[PDB]
Structures are given as C-alpha cells and as structure tokens.
Amino acid sequence: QGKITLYEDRGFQGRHYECSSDHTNLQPYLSRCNSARVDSGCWMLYEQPNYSGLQYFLRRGDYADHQQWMGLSDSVRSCRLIPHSGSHRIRLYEREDYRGQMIEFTEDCSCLQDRFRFNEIHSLNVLEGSWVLYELSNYRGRQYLLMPGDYRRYQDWGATNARVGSLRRVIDFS
Length: 174
Prior knowledge:
Helices cover 0% and strands 37% of the residues. It is an all-beta fold. The strands form three sheets. Strands 1, 2, 3, 4 and 5 form a five-stranded antiparallel sheet that branches. A four-stranded antiparallel sheet has the order 7-6-8-11, with no helix packed on it. A three-stranded antiparallel sheet has the order 10-9-12, with no helix packed on it. Strand 9 (131-134) and strand 10 form a beta hairpin. Belongs to the beta/gamma-crystallin family.
C-alpha cells in the first residue's frame, strides 16, 4: 500500500519520513518536504494538514525537489495514500444525482471533450480504485481526486465547479 520517502530537504537530504499509509500532519516529521521518493503507488500531498488546501499528485518516481511533483509550495503538512484496484471503471453523470447523461471510463482520458459532450460533471460513481479529473485536457491545469464511492454533485469532492476536461485512473500497477 504505497511507500514513499518524504524528505524535508531537496536532493533527498535533511530530515526524512516514510509514509505507507494515510497521514494528516507532516509537520511533526517534515519541516517542508522538498523531496520525495515513491516505490509503488499513488500519493497526494496537501499544503496544509488534514487534507485542506493546494495538493500535488505523486506516482512511482524520484523527486529531489518539490518542483518535480508540481510542488508549487514546499509547505507540505499532509499526505495520504490513494488506494488502487486491479480493474478500473468509473461512471460520470452530467447533472446532479443521476437524471442527466452518463458516460463510463475504464482507461486514461487525456481528452474527455472527445468522449463526452457536456463539460460539466455533477455526479460520478467510482466502482474500482480512484480517479483524477482535470479542468482541461492532457492535464494542463487543475486536478481533483475521486475516491471509490458515490457522488451526487460536484460539491461532494469539494469543487467550485464541474468543468472537467480530462481524467485518469489513479493506478500504475493493479
């Protein structure tokens, strides 16, 4: 279940901490977390503790700096593990609940505008692992996270809007 080595200082220096499970406060272990090494899994970090604020999606790889994982701010005080899943399947819904149009995805969607018309997703049903939504295509903007569950609106995943441009599955193994 994921396994990364968060480093207070870049180049994997300074104080370090290994996270193999959900964590809400990285302060008591990392002053800033300027570097991170992932073994196998997907991880998300949050600029503020208790998963609140701007975050950064991390996948198997070496990060000697915060800029590597898109770290905008080295003020990372929270990090969690996003579960995986052998198969991947998700059902997005146009409007709230399930009265609008629905389209399913079982693979990477670097260009939703090619698969679904409406750009507003106000409900989705994630059966397998988890997925990620991007305000644009080919991930050139913001990103949201949908854990395995049921959503009846866009606010459920704490989103100002529904505008979705692309999406992928949070997995690279099972």
